[PDB]
Amino acid sequence: XQXXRXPQ
């Protein structure tokens, strides 16, 4: 959900 690490 953050930083482009789409799953986080």
Side-chain angles (χ1 to χ4, degrees):
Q2 302 297 327
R5 287 174 80 176
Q8 317 198 131

